[PDB]
Design a protein around this nucleic acid. Sequence first.
RNA 1: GCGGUGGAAACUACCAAGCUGGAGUACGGUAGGGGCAGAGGGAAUUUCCGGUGGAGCGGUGAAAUGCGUAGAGAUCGGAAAGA
Length: 118
Amino acid sequence: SARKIPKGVIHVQASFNNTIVTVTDVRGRVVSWASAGTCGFRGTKRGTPFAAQTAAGNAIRTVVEQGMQRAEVMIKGPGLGRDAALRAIRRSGILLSFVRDVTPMPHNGCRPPKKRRV
RNA sequence: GCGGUGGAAACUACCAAGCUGGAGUACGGUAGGGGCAGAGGGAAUUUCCGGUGGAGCGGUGAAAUGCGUAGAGAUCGGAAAGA
């Protein structure tokens, strides 16, 4: 069983409502994912930093079948789950290699509504 | 107040000949999202197709409408298009 891929990039879609932590390989194929509204609590109880750690710590139950040694991290977008997702992945067992911020910086053109966030 | 006559002449005005500080022009340079037209560049968003993969995603002061196992979101590769 399993493909047994060495290292891989971890795409963390950090938003205000929730945080989707997905651990993918070298190419871009997802093995298994984990989210904030999946781990027990839902509604508005998520999106917080220590709710992101229970989400990123739920991935090591489904991706343990592959057996990854090293891991590169990748954060996208603002919110309370940027530095928190990196701390849970570190206390799990996998090593650090490349932490990058691929947040889409606009060239001042497209603008969404004002509205207050959580 | 109006008209006429005889004067005065600085000022205003008319005429003639000038002068120059006004203004204008040329010579040589400087900065600027000045304007019009035609190209081309980068990020991102949306959409279409395909791969991986899982049940959730989206949203709010809370929720719900909505999008989801005819499998989105997320992720990767490619395309199209507009600002």
